[PDB]
Amino acid sequence: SGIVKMVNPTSKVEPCVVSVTYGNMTLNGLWLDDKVYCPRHVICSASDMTNPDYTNLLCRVTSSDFTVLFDRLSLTVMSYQMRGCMLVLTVTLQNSRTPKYTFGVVKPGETFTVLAAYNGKPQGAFHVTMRSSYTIKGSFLCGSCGSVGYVIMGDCVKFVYMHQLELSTGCHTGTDFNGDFYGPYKDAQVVQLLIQDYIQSVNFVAWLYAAILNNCNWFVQSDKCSVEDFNVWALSNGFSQVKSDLVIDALASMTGVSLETLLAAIKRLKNGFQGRQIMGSCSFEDELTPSDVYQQL
């Protein structure tokens, strides 16, 4: 028993972290097969930052200007391409330790592991949840750009995130491996306000199902609220729309508690917990998906 925010082990991703250097700027990259992915803002001088013309910048750049470094092993660039807001660098050496990988995209509420790295050296890992603001609440410093976010599907690493920007204090965003930014965010030094965020409803239902299986069920009552009626209320109460997951149905069977019983509980809890905790908390814990709690039950 017990519920925590868990990360995937990091041994499949650690051998792919490289250092990428251009002029007086060093950030991180991902070395997969004969290619190195990294944020394109590595070619930005502190003068060309407010509205950078990346096509003009890539004219005065050659493969030789790029210094890719796996640990202390120098890698040689053959060519480079701009795929959205991401640079793809073809190297001469194949990454022998390339895992079985796929390039995916997370939706709000979904979770992944970030392998934080500085100077191509992994420092540690942390669990994040993509918010409805298309940002993550991470912990990143000066040289953290290019750190990747991933999810292990069986024996496959689904790479879903590349660290690019800090929009505000503790508010982070980046691109998918197609070079596309999550949300409307851009790689420019301008004021970037956040997209509207909500409490991730199905993730809070997951916390309640896990609480029931962790000997905590005070919130379960006679009351019942249909998915359709809860969705109408959620629009004006800071909650996201609920879509019944296959894992939600599995959790409902294990507890004998219908999803509709839990949606009614959420509405009551909106006006207060009244000093009662649910697994050590009086908050809307919405950072774990139904399948994140299922794996711990």
Partner whose footprint covers residue 238, from a second copy, ligand A1CBU, none (CB < 5 to 8 Å by kind): none
**Does the protein bind a second copy through residue 142 (CB under 8 A)?**
no
Q: Which does 263 bind (CB under 5 to 8 A by kind): a second copy, ligand A1CBU, none?
A: none
Nearer to a second copy, 137 or 243 (CB): 137
The C-alpha angle with vertex 58 and arms to 55 and 59, in degrees rounded to 5, equals 95
8 binds a second copy (CB under 8 A): yes
Q: Quick check: 52 binds a second copy (CB under 8 A)? A: no
85 versus 136: smaller Cβ distance to a second copy: 136
Is 145 one of the annotated active-site residues of the chain? Answer: yes
Minimal CA–CA distance to 106: which of 139, 131, 83? 131
130 vs 224: CA distance, rounded Å: 29
Residue 110 in the binding site for ligand A1CBU (CB under 6 A) = no
Q: Which CB atom, from 39 or from 138, has the smaller least distance to a second copy?
A: 138
- Rounded to whole angstroms, how far apart are CA atoms 11 and 28? 17
| 1 scored as a contact of a second copy (CB under 8 A) | yes
63 vs 215: CA distance, rounded Å: 60
- State yes or no: residue 23 binds a second copy (CB under 8 A): no
229's CB contacts (< 8 A; 6+ apart) are: none
What distance in Å separates the CA atoms of residue 63 and residue 129, rounded to the nearest whole number?
36
Tell me whether residue 19 or residue 261 sits nearer to ligand A1CBU (CB atom): 19
Q: Which residue has the tokens 């965020």?
A: 197
CB atoms within 10 A of CB 87: 26
Contact between 159 and 104 (Cβ < 8 Å): yes
The alpha carbon dihedral of 123, 128, 133, 137 has a sign of negative
State the Cα–Cα distance between residues 278 and 282, nearest whole angstrom.
6
Position among 57, 90, 93, 126 found at the interface with a second copy (CB under 8 A): 126
Based on the shown chain and the rule CB under 6 A, indicate whether residue 255 belongs to the binding site for ligand A1CBU: no
* 150 to 179: interface string for ligand A1CBU, x by CB under 6 A: ---------------xx-----x-------
Answer yes or no: 172 catalytic: no
Min dist CB 18 to a second copy, Å, is 15
Rounded Cα distance between 65 and 97, Å, is 26
Residues that bind a second copy (CB under 8 A): 1-11, 14, 115-116, 122-128, 137-141, 166, 169-172, 214-215, 279-280, 295-297
Residues that bind ligand A1CBU (CB under 6 A): 1, 27, 41, 44, 49, 52, 140-145, 165-166, 172, 187-189
Give the residue numbers annotated as catalytic, written as ranges. Answer: 41, 143, 145
